[PDB]
Amino acid sequence: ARKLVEQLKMEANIDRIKVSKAAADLMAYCEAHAKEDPLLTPVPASENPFR
């Protein structure tokens, strides 16, 4: 109906970016935050609150 078609009318009028650009942004965030990620590398027990 009118409500159902309005639910997706604005979906067409959206800006889609390149998937390569999105992957580059994700890679940049991961690499700029990889250093401060205790789950990636084993955190030393000195600063680890779970000794």
Added chain:
Amino acid sequence: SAEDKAAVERSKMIDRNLREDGEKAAREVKLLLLGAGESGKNTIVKQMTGIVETHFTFKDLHFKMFDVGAQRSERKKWIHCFEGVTAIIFCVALSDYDLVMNRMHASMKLFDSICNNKWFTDTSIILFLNKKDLFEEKIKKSPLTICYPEYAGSNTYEEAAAYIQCQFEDLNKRKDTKEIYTHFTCSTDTKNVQFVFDAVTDVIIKNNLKDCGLF
């Protein structure tokens, strides 16, 4: 460390409260009421927002019965929340055999789904069959063959009620570890709580027999 001592005392008292609440809730017979709509849930509750709890004691035995009729959504996303209830009290109105498919067939489908359910493999069902007098009036006014086309009995209480009971028992598939306690209830039958007490005691006895290796 005064803060640590206070935290330890708080943990100890919280553990005490949790343990005592668990002990209180262990000695309660958990019952799950059902029914495909106007099958007699209100009558069963009166003679004894989203979920209604009826907590009643009979012969020093506590029953807590949960009705989820007002909960209209996908059942499988919350049905497991009732895994471990002592018994299921499924209610079916005998007068709904002719009403419209049929409310009787809808009740049968719901009964099958929650009986052969994988969260309710080893739990017993206390089936009620309400409105026997109205069922008699309706079978005098019209045959039962509308609900069950493959029927050849007479339009009397005995044959029709027995066939309905047999059809509802046949839906059970876990015959090894569950049994159905069919009863016939009217608006004046005062033995319903007695029957549910008998069924609960029987299932507890059978569970103890299985635990000791004698069943």
Added chain:
Amino acid sequence: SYQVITSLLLGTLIFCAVLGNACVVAAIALERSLQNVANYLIGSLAVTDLMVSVLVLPMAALYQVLNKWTLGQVTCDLFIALDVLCCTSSIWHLCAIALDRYWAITDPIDYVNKRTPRRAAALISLTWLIGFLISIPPMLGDPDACTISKDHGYTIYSTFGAFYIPLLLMLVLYGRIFRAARFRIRKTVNAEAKRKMALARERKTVKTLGIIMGTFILCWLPFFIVALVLPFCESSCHMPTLLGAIINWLGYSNSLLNPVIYAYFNKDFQNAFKKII
């Protein structure tokens, strides 16, 4: 060569009993689903059998191998007292298990409302009180021979309090349980399938009660009928040493067999073993 075979054959039995009891206790301790009243009784029985097979079994094997008890006399009295404490404690653990099963099978209302771990604690305390009060009278009142007292009075008192009164208690409790369970199975009963299931359940309860009573009887009855008759007819009938030792170790094997009956046949314990290994 004959003294090493009889030592290894007894050491193997002692090791099997110790490992079995230790495994049962470990399964109960390392599981949260196995901490109920029934499993508490079974695990107390397993602990008692562990005490038997760890304390009184190595010294019994040493006495069997070295025909002479060179380990003093007060030590012999102490070991006899500990033995007649632990064995009667095992028997009364069996009786307590039977009585708790009887209460659970007869009274659902009690089973739901009043059942608590304090009931199991009281049962175990009564069992061990009986054990101590049976073991202590010998302490109150051939050097190379360690045997129980043969006074007629204490002999009949201990044999009845540790095997005959417990035997009658278990017999009547399990008989009433048998009739109650038969009534339940008949009450539960297409129709042919229902009656076949009822007959299968009846055979199952008959077999379980037979296993329990056979483990009790075939183990301790040959020991206790001898302990009752021999002190009255010392010289009328000869008691061979080999046959007496076989009877004594037949009684001793009850501690080994108790886990195999009460825990190693139990589905919860089997599941705990499978999950822990």
Added chain:
Amino acid sequence: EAEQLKNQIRDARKACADATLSQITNNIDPVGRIQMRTRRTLRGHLAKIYAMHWGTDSRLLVSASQDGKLIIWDSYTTNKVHAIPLRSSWVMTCAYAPSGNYVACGGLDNICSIYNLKTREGNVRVSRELAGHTGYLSCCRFLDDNQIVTSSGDTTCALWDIETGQQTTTFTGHTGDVMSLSLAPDTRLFVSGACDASAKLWDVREGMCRQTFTGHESDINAICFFPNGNAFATGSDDATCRLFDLRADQELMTYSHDNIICGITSVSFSKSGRLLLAGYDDFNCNVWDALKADRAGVLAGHDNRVSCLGVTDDGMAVATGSWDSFLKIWN
């Protein structure tokens, strides 16, 4: 109409991508495999655990159990801090306030109960009751001490004002029951998954479905927001997890394996977002890689299905709560 209008969106789904994320992401070295160990274990609940939520302090955490209890821990010292009794014991969700002064819960009672925690007298009282839903309250998430966003089994999400007590906004459009709910880091939008295999991104300010993604093939159970804020991850009963991008409007990566056949109950992201952790019906929590779609270890199983998990905002710990009434901390 709507079905015809969906055609151009479907065409753009493949026109804007014309590739796969694996080709772009296959040029980086995988991070070293991590063997997380159960640092702490929280006990005290007596029934199945249905939800948990880390506090913003990275130390406290709430947990909801079917026994009728909502417990609040202190994972660094394992000691209890609170145990709120419930009006209804059929609780299936809980939430922690970002301020930490409030805790939400809800379940089959079709009402989101808000419990205050800055009480001088030391106990807990219900600050507000929100019973405008006609279905079980599957999920809830605080935006502040004033506004919350719930999602119920009546195929409806709702932005509630706690002080007003009424639905300030109602998010409709989900065909099935909404089971999952995640908030964007800026809280200007949120994403909610439901049982119709669709995750919808809604703007809180306008209350309109800004985006819709139909990647999953079964009932979505869990959802989380990537730390970047331009992507999110979704886990369903199809034994698979997916990552979708807000700007790209396309599913990027799919996480699945032959050793996983059961449904996913909870998902979350790490501090950098590199690792994706998801708890399954097979007792296990698997740690994935958001840039390579390869596993980085399986946490030691609970005794029952793991119903919830949570990665701390600083990435310092991962809690998993299961249907066996235990909460395991991994680090």
